[PDB]
Amino acid sequence: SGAIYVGNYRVVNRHLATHNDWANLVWEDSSRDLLVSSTTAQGCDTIARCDCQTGVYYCSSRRKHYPVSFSKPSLIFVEASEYYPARYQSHLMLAVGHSEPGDCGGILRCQHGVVGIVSTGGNGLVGFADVRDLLWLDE
């Protein structure tokens, strides 16, 4: 689990979105595993606007943060789960690192702020859903 709070928005994995997230829907993209909902309270996380390929991510299955090198956001074929069939997920970044299904929602951060959130994994690789291109989150 996990979410990013910026301004009047909440950014979550689309497959983990609650009934309340869907009732206050702003934007969703099934190909990216992302959903954004509106909030009453003002969030204060900072979104990174950069092309960093190094950062740190939170791994709840180990209660630890790991520093990683990750690829640039792209279109990668990912295997099926109970939430999605096997498909091409877009705006996805991979890194060598540990992850489990329950780790989805953990934030990946660089010196500039929040880069994205854990969304896919397997074979000793962890995938993150990029949020740096969503410029409207700051207004």
Ligand SMILES: Cn1nc(C(=O)NCCc2cscn2)c2ccccc21
């Ligand atoms: C981080 N992580 N996530 C999952 C997962 O099944 N849930 C996401 C659902 C999904 C499927 S394709 C994009 N999102 C996973 C499975 C094994 C190991 C690590 C993992």
Ligand SMILES: [Zn+2]
């Ligand atoms: Zn950066």
